[PDB]
Amino acid sequence: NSIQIGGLFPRGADQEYSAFRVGMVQFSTSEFRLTPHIDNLEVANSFAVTN
Amino acid sequence: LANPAVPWGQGVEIERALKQVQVEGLSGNIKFDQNGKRINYTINIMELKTN
Ligand SMILES: *[C@@H]1O[C@H](CO)[C@@H](O)[C@H](O)[C@H]1NC(C)=O
Numbered sequence: 001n002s003i004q005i006g007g008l009f010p011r012g013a014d015q016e017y018s019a020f021r022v023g024m025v026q027f028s029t030s031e032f033r034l035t036p037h038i039d040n041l042e043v044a045n046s047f048a049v050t051n
Numbered sequence: 052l053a054n055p056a057v058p059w060g061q062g063v064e065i066e067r068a069l070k071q072v073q074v075e076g077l078s079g080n081i082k083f084d085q086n087g088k089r090i091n092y093t094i095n096i097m098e099l100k101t102n
Contacts, residue, residue, distance in 0.1 A: 051052055
């Protein structure tokens, strides 16, 4: 019951990813578990976001 | 899309080639700056009259 979810954090976002991980810890459950793949990028770059 | 993207060298040369172009055309004198915007254009200012 593994659920793969992608994520995109703009370089320089720390507390956001922190709150993301904290959220991962608090809302974790025995039924299913989210398996995030995080990718840091330049959010203003359209090419980077597309890729 | 292949990562990391690698650009071809020739491209820069073609770019410089295009930007250095100065020609005569329907829009008048056509010339570009380093960034690619139009330069030395003539915009005819027109008014609608009865005739
Ligand atoms: C062409 O554009 C440049 C950029 O502003 C300007 O300095 C120059 O006077 C222009 N030439 C004419 C004939 O308008």
